[PDB]
Automatic annotation (TrEMBL), chain E:
Stretch list, region Disordered: 1-14
Source organism (scientific name): Thermus thermophilus
A molecular-function term among this protein's GO annotations: structural constituent of ribosome
Protein known as: Large ribosomal subunit protein bL27
Record PROSITE patterns: RIBOSOMAL_L27
Amino acid sequence: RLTAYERRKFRVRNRIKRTGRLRLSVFRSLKHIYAQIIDDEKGVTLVSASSLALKLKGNKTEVARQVGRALAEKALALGIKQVAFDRGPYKYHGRVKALAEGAREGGLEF
Amino acid sequence: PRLKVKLVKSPIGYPKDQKAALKALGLRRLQQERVLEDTPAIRGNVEKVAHLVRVEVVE
Amino acid sequence: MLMPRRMKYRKQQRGRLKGATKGGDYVAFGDYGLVALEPAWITAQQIEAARVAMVRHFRRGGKIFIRIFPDKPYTKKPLEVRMGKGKGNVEGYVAVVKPGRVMFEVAGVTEEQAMEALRIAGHKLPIKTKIVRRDAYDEAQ
Amino acid sequence: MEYRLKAYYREGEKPSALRRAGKLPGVMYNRHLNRKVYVDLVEFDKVFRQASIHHVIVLELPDGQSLPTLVRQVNLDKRRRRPEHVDFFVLSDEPVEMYVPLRFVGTPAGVRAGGVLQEIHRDILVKVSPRNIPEFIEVDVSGLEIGDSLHASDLKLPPGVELAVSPEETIAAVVPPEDVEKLAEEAAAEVAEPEVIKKG
Amino acid sequence: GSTRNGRDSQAKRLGVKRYEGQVVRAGNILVRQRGTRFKPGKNVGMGRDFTLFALVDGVVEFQDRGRLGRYVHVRPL
RNA sequence: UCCCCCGUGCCCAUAGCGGCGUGGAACCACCCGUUCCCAUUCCGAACACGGAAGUGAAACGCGCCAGCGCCGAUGGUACUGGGCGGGCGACCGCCUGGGAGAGUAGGUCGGUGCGGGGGA
RNA sequence: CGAUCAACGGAUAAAAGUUACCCCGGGGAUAACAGGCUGAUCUCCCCCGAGCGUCCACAGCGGCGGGGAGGUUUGGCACCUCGAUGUCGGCUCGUCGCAUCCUGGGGCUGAAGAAGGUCCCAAGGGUUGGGCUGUUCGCCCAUUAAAGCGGCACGCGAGCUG
RNA sequence: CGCCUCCUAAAAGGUAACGGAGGCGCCCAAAGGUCCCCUCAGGCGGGACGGAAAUCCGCCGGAGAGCGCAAGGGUAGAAGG
RNA sequence: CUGACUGGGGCCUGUAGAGCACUGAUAGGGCUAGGGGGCCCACCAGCCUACCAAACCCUGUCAAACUCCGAAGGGUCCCAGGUGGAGCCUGGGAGUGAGGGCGCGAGCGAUAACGUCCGCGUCCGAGCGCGGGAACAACCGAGACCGCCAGCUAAGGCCCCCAAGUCUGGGCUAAGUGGUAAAGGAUGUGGCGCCGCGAAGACAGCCAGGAGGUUGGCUUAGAAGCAGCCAUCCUUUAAAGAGUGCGUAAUAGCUCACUGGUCGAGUGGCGCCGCGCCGAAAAUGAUCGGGGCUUAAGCCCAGCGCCGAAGCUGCGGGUCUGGG
Ligand SMILES: [Mg+2]
Ligand SMILES: [Mg+2]
Ligand SMILES: [Mg+2]
Ligand SMILES: [Mg+2]
Ligand SMILES: [Mg+2]
Ligand SMILES: [Mg+2]
Ligand SMILES: [Mg+2]
Ligand SMILES: [Mg+2]
Ligand SMILES: [Mg+2]
Ligand SMILES: [Mg+2]
Ligand SMILES: [Mg+2]
Ligand SMILES: [Mg+2]
Ligand SMILES: [Mg+2]
Ligand SMILES: [Mg+2]
Ligand SMILES: [Mg+2]
Ligand SMILES: [Mg+2]
Ligand SMILES: [Mg+2]
Ligand SMILES: [Mg+2]
Ligand SMILES: [Mg+2]
Ligand SMILES: [Mg+2]
Ligand SMILES: [Mg+2]
Ligand SMILES: [Mg+2]
Ligand SMILES: [Mg+2]
Ligand SMILES: [Mg+2]
Ligand SMILES: [Mg+2]
Ligand SMILES: [Mg+2]
Ligand SMILES: [Mg+2]
Ligand SMILES: [Mg+2]
Ligand SMILES: [Mg+2]
Ligand SMILES: [Mg+2]
Ligand SMILES: [Mg+2]
Ligand SMILES: [Mg+2]
Ligand SMILES: [Mg+2]
Ligand SMILES: [Mg+2]
Ligand SMILES: [Mg+2]
Ligand SMILES: [Mg+2]
Ligand SMILES: [Mg+2]
Ligand SMILES: [Mg+2]
Ligand SMILES: [Mg+2]
Ligand SMILES: [Mg+2]
Ligand SMILES: [Mg+2]
Ligand SMILES: [Mg+2]
Ligand SMILES: [Mg+2]
Ligand SMILES: [Mg+2]
Ligand SMILES: [Mg+2]
Ligand SMILES: [Mg+2]
Ligand SMILES: [Mg+2]
Ligand SMILES: [Mg+2]
Ligand SMILES: [Mg+2]
Ligand SMILES: [Mg+2]
Ligand SMILES: [Mg+2]
Ligand SMILES: [Mg+2]
Ligand SMILES: [Mg+2]
Ligand SMILES: [Mg+2]
Ligand SMILES: [Mg+2]
Ligand SMILES: [Mg+2]
Ligand SMILES: [Mg+2]
Ligand SMILES: [Mg+2]
Ligand SMILES: [Mg+2]
Ligand SMILES: [Mg+2]
Ligand SMILES: [Mg+2]
Ligand SMILES: [Mg+2]
Ligand SMILES: [Mg+2]
Ligand SMILES: [Mg+2]
Ligand SMILES: [Mg+2]
Ligand SMILES: [Mg+2]
Ligand SMILES: [Mg+2]
Ligand SMILES: [Mg+2]
Ligand SMILES: [Mg+2]
Ligand SMILES: [Mg+2]
Ligand SMILES: [Mg+2]
Ligand SMILES: [Mg+2]
Ligand SMILES: [Mg+2]
Ligand SMILES: [Mg+2]
Ligand SMILES: [Mg+2]
Ligand SMILES: [Mg+2]
Ligand SMILES: [Mg+2]
Ligand SMILES: [Mg+2]
Ligand SMILES: [Mg+2]
Ligand SMILES: [Mg+2]
Ligand SMILES: [Mg+2]
Ligand SMILES: [Mg+2]
Ligand SMILES: [Mg+2]
Ligand SMILES: [Mg+2]
Ligand SMILES: [Mg+2]
Ligand SMILES: [Mg+2]
Ligand SMILES: [Mg+2]
Ligand SMILES: [Mg+2]
Ligand SMILES: [Mg+2]
Ligand SMILES: [Mg+2]
Ligand SMILES: [Mg+2]
Ligand SMILES: [Mg+2]
Ligand SMILES: [Mg+2]
Ligand SMILES: [Mg+2]
Ligand SMILES: [Mg+2]
Ligand SMILES: [Mg+2]
Ligand SMILES: [Mg+2]
Ligand SMILES: [Mg+2]
Ligand SMILES: [Mg+2]
Ligand SMILES: [Mg+2]
Ligand SMILES: [Mg+2]
Ligand SMILES: [Mg+2]
Ligand SMILES: [Mg+2]
Ligand SMILES: [Mg+2]
Ligand SMILES: [Mg+2]
Ligand SMILES: [Mg+2]
Ligand SMILES: [Mg+2]
Ligand SMILES: [Mg+2]
Ligand SMILES: [Mg+2]
Ligand SMILES: [Mg+2]
Ligand SMILES: [Mg+2]
Ligand SMILES: [Mg+2]
Ligand SMILES: [Mg+2]
Ligand SMILES: [Mg+2]
Ligand SMILES: [Mg+2]
Ligand SMILES: [Mg+2]
Ligand SMILES: [Mg+2]
Ligand SMILES: [Mg+2]
Ligand SMILES: [Mg+2]
Ligand SMILES: [Mg+2]
Ligand SMILES: [Mg+2]
Ligand SMILES: [Mg+2]
Ligand SMILES: [Mg+2]
Ligand SMILES: [Mg+2]
Ligand SMILES: [Mg+2]
Ligand SMILES: [Mg+2]
Ligand SMILES: [Mg+2]
Ligand SMILES: [Mg+2]
Ligand SMILES: [Mg+2]
Ligand SMILES: [Mg+2]
Ligand SMILES: [Mg+2]
Ligand SMILES: [Mg+2]
Ligand SMILES: [Mg+2]
Ligand SMILES: [Mg+2]
Ligand SMILES: [Mg+2]
Ligand SMILES: [Mg+2]
Ligand SMILES: [Mg+2]
Ligand SMILES: [Mg+2]
Ligand SMILES: [Mg+2]
Ligand SMILES: [Mg+2]
Ligand SMILES: [Mg+2]
Ligand SMILES: [Mg+2]
Ligand SMILES: [Mg+2]
Ligand SMILES: [Mg+2]
Ligand SMILES: [Mg+2]
Ligand SMILES: [Mg+2]
Ligand SMILES: [Mg+2]
Ligand SMILES: [Mg+2]
Ligand SMILES: [Mg+2]
Ligand SMILES: [Mg+2]
Ligand SMILES: [Mg+2]
Ligand SMILES: [Mg+2]
Ligand SMILES: [Mg+2]
Ligand SMILES: [Mg+2]
Ligand SMILES: [Mg+2]
Ligand SMILES: [Mg+2]
Ligand SMILES: [Mg+2]
Ligand SMILES: [Mg+2]
Ligand SMILES: [Mg+2]
Ligand SMILES: [Mg+2]
Ligand SMILES: [Mg+2]
Ligand SMILES: [Mg+2]
Ligand SMILES: [Mg+2]
Ligand SMILES: [Mg+2]
Ligand SMILES: [Mg+2]
Ligand SMILES: [Mg+2]
Ligand SMILES: [Mg+2]
Ligand SMILES: [Mg+2]
Ligand SMILES: [Mg+2]
Ligand SMILES: [Mg+2]
Ligand SMILES: [Mg+2]
Ligand SMILES: [Mg+2]
Ligand SMILES: [Mg+2]
Ligand SMILES: [Mg+2]
Ligand SMILES: [Mg+2]
Ligand SMILES: [Mg+2]
Ligand SMILES: [Mg+2]
Ligand SMILES: [Mg+2]
Ligand SMILES: [Mg+2]
Ligand SMILES: [Mg+2]
Ligand SMILES: [Mg+2]
Ligand SMILES: [Mg+2]
Ligand SMILES: [Mg+2]
Ligand SMILES: [Mg+2]
Ligand SMILES: [Mg+2]
Ligand SMILES: [Mg+2]
Ligand SMILES: [Mg+2]
Ligand SMILES: [Mg+2]
Ligand SMILES: [Mg+2]
Ligand SMILES: [Mg+2]
Ligand SMILES: [Mg+2]
Ligand SMILES: [Mg+2]
Ligand SMILES: [Mg+2]
Ligand SMILES: [Mg+2]
Ligand SMILES: [Mg+2]
Ligand SMILES: [Mg+2]
Ligand SMILES: [Mg+2]
Ligand SMILES: [Mg+2]
Ligand SMILES: [Mg+2]
Ligand SMILES: [Mg+2]
Ligand SMILES: [Mg+2]
Ligand SMILES: [Mg+2]
Ligand SMILES: [Mg+2]
Ligand SMILES: [Mg+2]
Ligand SMILES: [Mg+2]
Ligand SMILES: [Mg+2]
Ligand SMILES: [Mg+2]
Ligand SMILES: [Mg+2]
Ligand SMILES: [Mg+2]
Ligand SMILES: [Mg+2]
Ligand SMILES: [Mg+2]
Ligand SMILES: [Mg+2]
Ligand SMILES: [Mg+2]
Ligand SMILES: [Mg+2]
Ligand SMILES: [Mg+2]
Ligand SMILES: [Mg+2]
Ligand SMILES: [Mg+2]
Ligand SMILES: [Mg+2]
Ligand SMILES: [Mg+2]
Ligand SMILES: [Mg+2]
Ligand SMILES: [Mg+2]
Ligand SMILES: [Mg+2]
Ligand SMILES: [Mg+2]
Ligand SMILES: [Mg+2]
Ligand SMILES: [Mg+2]
Ligand SMILES: [Mg+2]
Ligand SMILES: [Mg+2]
Ligand SMILES: [Mg+2]
Ligand SMILES: [Mg+2]
Ligand SMILES: [Mg+2]
Ligand SMILES: [Mg+2]
Ligand SMILES: [Mg+2]
Ligand SMILES: [Mg+2]
Ligand SMILES: [Mg+2]
Ligand SMILES: [Mg+2]
Ligand SMILES: [Mg+2]
Ligand SMILES: [Mg+2]
Ligand SMILES: [Mg+2]
Ligand SMILES: [Mg+2]
Ligand SMILES: [Mg+2]
Ligand SMILES: [Mg+2]
Ligand SMILES: [Mg+2]
Ligand SMILES: [Mg+2]
Ligand SMILES: [Mg+2]
Ligand SMILES: [Mg+2]
Ligand SMILES: [Mg+2]
Ligand SMILES: [Mg+2]
Ligand SMILES: [Mg+2]
Ligand SMILES: [Mg+2]
Ligand SMILES: [Mg+2]
Ligand SMILES: [Mg+2]
Ligand SMILES: [Mg+2]
Ligand SMILES: [Mg+2]
Ligand SMILES: [Mg+2]
Ligand SMILES: [Mg+2]
Ligand SMILES: [Mg+2]
Ligand SMILES: [Mg+2]
Ligand SMILES: [Mg+2]
Ligand SMILES: [Mg+2]
Ligand SMILES: [Mg+2]
Ligand SMILES: [Mg+2]
């Protein structure tokens, strides 16, 4: 028995599966936001970044901008430029969007 | 491991694939014998028409 | 007699009478049972005779248990026509029976009355018949 | 109450060959072991026609093993009505589901009117240890008219047994009997021709 | 008395044209089907009528994923 | 490189249902708000956002219970490739090899990959 | 862009029938006659016995149902004959199978006896004259020991008949 | 009498009968394309007129829904709305 | 060497069988709306349902167009084997596109066709050439270059017609079954089991008894043991059912079973298998091909030879191709 949350997390990532690119995995809790990039072929995560693990304090919008600006640097240090953005069940707005601008201003290509 | 093959019956009236196996083994006349090396690639041939043929084991 | 009230199709092919019966080979209803031997299509027009004669022999008591069913529709063309012009019209509903089938089971009736009651069906049915008592082998499966 | 038999092992024989010679092939097993055996038919039918799965049958191997066993299944020949295979369970102190026969005592009321007593389950599936085995289960059917339903929830059980099926199963019933005057009205009407399902 | 039957459609030659381990070229058709009896895997191109063709020049291999349906993979040698 | 824990893949019910217990420090989840962004074919339900006092009651995670479901041999048997016979027929036997399905014995209240938090 | 060119791979943009006045080239590839194979149908026979038969399952009877022979009915397939195998009925000539109409020998009888219903063995002879109509059939007329059913290209036109 | 679907069809393709069965010679200006959003039919219990069945809600609930039209194939982790 | 074909290997698959998980079928059973009927109201339900029975469940079943499962096989590719009137690119020259019998599956037919239409194979066609099979294109054996008055076998035969055993060993049949068939009927008979009854004397024959309530009852007109049934219980017993058949208008009666004796050892009834009987009547004269065979000259099992084909070897040589 599935729900609308699991269906919305399923359908957009199903759309991303045809891309084959490095997926920007988003997990948004009430307190923090977490993002680690995985290779869908071999099932190996490249690098991780979040707000809790980076010891952030307050508003998750600007905080999400910060975790993007902190995530993209290691990607430019490992040679990852072309990427995609998966939103999962969350809508592309607010916290997650500010995180996306955090990555795009961080130097990624999406 | 070698096998001396001796034909016992004539191939008249039998299906065509069996005739093609007899041609793969090189049987154009009756009662003709031939000592062939024992490998499953040749044994599987004789297994098909074994009822028309006889086989002797040598060396 | 017996005939289904509704069917998906009115016509069927003849199939093949090969093999033995896949089910209904052991008695599970009554004290005694009747096992058929020869393969045949069993019409309800053939079943009604054995049934009616047996209940006319009981005249009360006992229970008739039919374990087969006429699911095979039988066809035939009109008289004096040529081959073709469609398939013959369906005029009956028969049942496929092969060696090993136990068509009829009976209980509430003692051995002798069961014997003659099962003896009438031997003649009123085309296939060879054999009378059985439900023993441990029929009880086991 | 308890029965015994003698058996021998078999390794490289054709089951059709032994079965023609009169030696029914078989394989005995439980969760701990597994072996191929064979048992003669002329010594099998006599014992099996009495205690099929309701009583215990201990087998004796050629080496001298005495194993209390119970036949789990019998594969009958679909043509000759003669058993072509048998399964033998190997018992222990562990409880397991088995079958037990039902003895129906008492003269029913509906029978006195010439009725018919149908017995759905002369055997019942009940989990119990081999040491707590009763030989059968007594049930009073003297209060059966034409006609009321009897089920498995009415069972009285000797201590130590566990019913393995749902109590809603009907184990017996009383059915309307045949009649000559029913055949006259049985043909007094015509049933409708099969109404086909309209395709499309 | 006459006939109302005898009408039918031509066969569509339905099936798979390339099996496991075979040599293919870019554009060679692999599978023909109705609906989704197969699902495209790696380098498995598919059109509108469910025709599966070779996306690249490679070797064919099949797998069954159970609940997700059977998939095909065309490997670079 | 050991425990628990947050994502995320794979195997595709041996992974579900049901019932019982259990954990809030971190986490996670409910939660406190509806001004802001957004939202409701009505509704801050969900979705969205800002927070942190309360809270394991739910859900989820971790474990027991095999009621149900799932998985499933050993055989023998069914069928049949090849090779043969019988029977007027319907169809039936034998040799060689392959060998089901159903049932029976029992096995299942998951396994694992990487990256991450704390613990050791 | 003009398609019931819907016979849809579509002759031309223009097209029904009649032929006992018929012709040519063909077919046993292909109906009608005949044999053949089948026995669907028709004829005859046997199974089981509910019941009728006052009583009495069978003296004769035999619901519902079942197993077969014969190749005499209509049909099925179109196998040799269309460089022909003359089609129904009648005349004539016989011979043949008994599922026997009469005659002979019989069991059973609801057989007092006569006469008779049913079943058994048996083809040796017999199996009448006529009106009707083309009739085969069949109703009728006076009889009868009885006025039988079928086979032989529904025998028989290189014998007539027409 | 052209075309489609079922099986006959003998586990590739294919396979004929005057064999057994239904459909077509249209439609959609969105019922096409792309983003986002969402899950049914059906059973238990409740409820204005008002319901076996109108709509909504509570529990169960894998496709038994539905997708212009016959059929199969396919299918909600959408193709459906 | 790329071919028919063989082995390893992975993939493609859904018919036989199999089963209820969907769609349908579904006899009986359990539950329960619903009604129909019926007690009981117009006063509105209630209760009983040996009534058909929705939904749901159980026991047991069915399907070419149903499938929770699913091979033997089929195909294709990879590689190995494998060299043959095998394979392939291009060029020229055709013939056929009336098939037929059979085998396996299916339909159409009527579980008919010397019937037809389909997929696979063989064969006849084109091998009416050869041995069998009595002769008979397609059933079995076997592909003829021809020349030997040599040899070995296949099918099939080995009593004579006619070459080879009236050859051995066991067992079967008594019907000339063999040498055309059925459902069915049977003191036919042979091979394996199962049993009981019977010297706590059976079966066969020979000697007594075989009774009462009760002409019982639902009961209608007679139903006295001897018509159906919703009764079969008992008494006295060595033994006796409230009656096996025969018998009556009911009766009456005889008798079966039965218990006892009489004679002193086997008897009779169920279930499997071999081979036989009746079932079995048609048209020119008979019949297994014949003559004729009964410890076979038949059926079954089981052995050692021989006969015998244009099939294979020796030997005599033609010709196409290949190595020299
Ligand atoms: Mg699921
Ligand atoms: Mg940098
Ligand atoms: Mg690129
Ligand atoms: Mg030799
Ligand atoms: Mg041959
Ligand atoms: Mg092949
Ligand atoms: Mg083949
Ligand atoms: Mg060849
Ligand atoms: Mg050659
Ligand atoms: Mg060699
Ligand atoms: Mg090998
Ligand atoms: Mg091998
Ligand atoms: Mg080997
Ligand atoms: Mg092979
Ligand atoms: Mg070998
Ligand atoms: Mg062999
Ligand atoms: Mg009726
Ligand atoms: Mg059957
Ligand atoms: Mg079953
Ligand atoms: Mg029939
Ligand atoms: Mg019939
Ligand atoms: Mg009728
Ligand atoms: Mg009939
Ligand atoms: Mg008519
Ligand atoms: Mg008529
Ligand atoms: Mg006509
Ligand atoms: Mg009718
Ligand atoms: Mg009829
Ligand atoms: Mg009929
Ligand atoms: Mg009918
Ligand atoms: Mg009883
Ligand atoms: Mg008894
Ligand atoms: Mg018999
Ligand atoms: Mg028996
Ligand atoms: Mg045997
Ligand atoms: Mg034996
Ligand atoms: Mg238990
Ligand atoms: Mg009445
Ligand atoms: Mg009734
Ligand atoms: Mg009435
Ligand atoms: Mg009637
Ligand atoms: Mg009436
Ligand atoms: Mg009436
Ligand atoms: Mg009715
Ligand atoms: Mg009426
Ligand atoms: Mg009528
Ligand atoms: Mg009708
Ligand atoms: Mg009608
Ligand atoms: Mg209609
Ligand atoms: Mg309508
Ligand atoms: Mg409608
Ligand atoms: Mg019609
Ligand atoms: Mg008509
Ligand atoms: Mg009309
Ligand atoms: Mg039409
Ligand atoms: Mg019409
Ligand atoms: Mg119409
Ligand atoms: Mg119609
Ligand atoms: Mg088709
Ligand atoms: Mg096409
Ligand atoms: Mg795999
Ligand atoms: Mg797998
Ligand atoms: Mg899926
Ligand atoms: Mg891989
Ligand atoms: Mg690999
Ligand atoms: Mg390499
Ligand atoms: Mg460390
Ligand atoms: Mg540890
Ligand atoms: Mg993997
Ligand atoms: Mg495990
Ligand atoms: Mg489940
Ligand atoms: Mg809990
Ligand atoms: Mg249950
Ligand atoms: Mg499994
Ligand atoms: Mg093969
Ligand atoms: Mg026989
Ligand atoms: Mg014949
Ligand atoms: Mg038959
Ligand atoms: Mg193999
Ligand atoms: Mg089950
Ligand atoms: Mg365990
Ligand atoms: Mg998990
Ligand atoms: Mg696992
Ligand atoms: Mg894991
Ligand atoms: Mg750590
Ligand atoms: Mg116009
Ligand atoms: Mg026009
Ligand atoms: Mg025109
Ligand atoms: Mg025209
Ligand atoms: Mg028209
Ligand atoms: Mg026109
Ligand atoms: Mg024109
Ligand atoms: Mg006109
Ligand atoms: Mg016109
Ligand atoms: Mg006209
Ligand atoms: Mg005129
Ligand atoms: Mg005229
Ligand atoms: Mg005319
Ligand atoms: Mg003139
Ligand atoms: Mg003229
Ligand atoms: Mg002229
Ligand atoms: Mg002319
Ligand atoms: Mg014509
Ligand atoms: Mg005509
Ligand atoms: Mg014609
Ligand atoms: Mg005319
Ligand atoms: Mg005419
Ligand atoms: Mg005609
Ligand atoms: Mg004719
Ligand atoms: Mg004749
Ligand atoms: Mg004729
Ligand atoms: Mg004939
Ligand atoms: Mg006949
Ligand atoms: Mg005949
Ligand atoms: Mg008669
Ligand atoms: Mg009577
Ligand atoms: Mg009477
Ligand atoms: Mg009379
Ligand atoms: Mg009669
Ligand atoms: Mg009547
Ligand atoms: Mg009749
Ligand atoms: Mg009749
Ligand atoms: Mg009849
Ligand atoms: Mg008949
Ligand atoms: Mg008949
Ligand atoms: Mg005849
Ligand atoms: Mg006549
Ligand atoms: Mg006539
Ligand atoms: Mg007439
Ligand atoms: Mg007529
Ligand atoms: Mg005619
Ligand atoms: Mg023809
Ligand atoms: Mg001439
Ligand atoms: Mg003429
Ligand atoms: Mg003339
Ligand atoms: Mg004429
Ligand atoms: Mg005429
Ligand atoms: Mg005429
Ligand atoms: Mg005249
Ligand atoms: Mg004259
Ligand atoms: Mg005359
Ligand atoms: Mg005469
Ligand atoms: Mg005669
Ligand atoms: Mg007569
Ligand atoms: Mg007479
Ligand atoms: Mg006389
Ligand atoms: Mg007399
Ligand atoms: Mg007289
Ligand atoms: Mg009369
Ligand atoms: Mg005469
Ligand atoms: Mg005569
Ligand atoms: Mg004479
Ligand atoms: Mg004379
Ligand atoms: Mg004469
Ligand atoms: Mg005369
Ligand atoms: Mg005369
Ligand atoms: Mg005269
Ligand atoms: Mg006439
Ligand atoms: Mg005449
Ligand atoms: Mg005359
Ligand atoms: Mg007339
Ligand atoms: Mg008159
Ligand atoms: Mg008059
Ligand atoms: Mg007058
Ligand atoms: Mg007169
Ligand atoms: Mg006269
Ligand atoms: Mg005459
Ligand atoms: Mg005629
Ligand atoms: Mg004439
Ligand atoms: Mg004239
Ligand atoms: Mg004239
Ligand atoms: Mg055409
Ligand atoms: Mg198909
Ligand atoms: Mg292909
Ligand atoms: Mg091709
Ligand atoms: Mg083809
Ligand atoms: Mg054709
Ligand atoms: Mg139109
Ligand atoms: Mg649409
Ligand atoms: Mg809903
Ligand atoms: Mg449609
Ligand atoms: Mg559809
Ligand atoms: Mg998906
Ligand atoms: Mg190659
Ligand atoms: Mg080929
Ligand atoms: Mg070829
Ligand atoms: Mg190959
Ligand atoms: Mg290899
Ligand atoms: Mg492997
Ligand atoms: Mg019904
Ligand atoms: Mg009534
Ligand atoms: Mg269920
Ligand atoms: Mg397998
Ligand atoms: Mg293979
Ligand atoms: Mg092939
Ligand atoms: Mg291919
Ligand atoms: Mg490889
Ligand atoms: Mg390679
Ligand atoms: Mg080589
Ligand atoms: Mg060479
Ligand atoms: Mg070469
Ligand atoms: Mg060459
Ligand atoms: Mg050539
Ligand atoms: Mg060439
Ligand atoms: Mg090529
Ligand atoms: Mg050139
Ligand atoms: Mg060329
Ligand atoms: Mg050409
Ligand atoms: Mg033609
Ligand atoms: Mg033709
Ligand atoms: Mg052909
Ligand atoms: Mg042909
Ligand atoms: Mg045929
Ligand atoms: Mg053969
Ligand atoms: Mg074959
Ligand atoms: Mg008929
Ligand atoms: Mg048939
Ligand atoms: Mg015939
Ligand atoms: Mg036939
Ligand atoms: Mg035919
Ligand atoms: Mg063909
Ligand atoms: Mg084949
Ligand atoms: Mg040839
Ligand atoms: Mg010849
Ligand atoms: Mg012959
Ligand atoms: Mg002959
Ligand atoms: Mg034959
Ligand atoms: Mg012949
Ligand atoms: Mg000389
Ligand atoms: Mg030879
Ligand atoms: Mg001879
Ligand atoms: Mg001679
Ligand atoms: Mg000679
Ligand atoms: Mg005879
Ligand atoms: Mg004859
Ligand atoms: Mg005959
Ligand atoms: Mg014979
Ligand atoms: Mg026979
Ligand atoms: Mg008998
Ligand atoms: Mg005394
Ligand atoms: Mg005394
Ligand atoms: Mg024997
Ligand atoms: Mg026999
Ligand atoms: Mg016989
Ligand atoms: Mg005779
Ligand atoms: Mg005769
Ligand atoms: Mg005689
Ligand atoms: Mg004669
Ligand atoms: Mg004769
Ligand atoms: Mg002779
Ligand atoms: Mg024998
Ligand atoms: Mg011998
Ligand atoms: Mg000697
Ligand atoms: Mg020579
Ligand atoms: Mg030569
Ligand atoms: Mg020498
Ligand atoms: Mg020379
Ligand atoms: Mg020279
Ligand atoms: Mg050359
Ligand atoms: Mg060379
Ligand atoms: Mg040299």
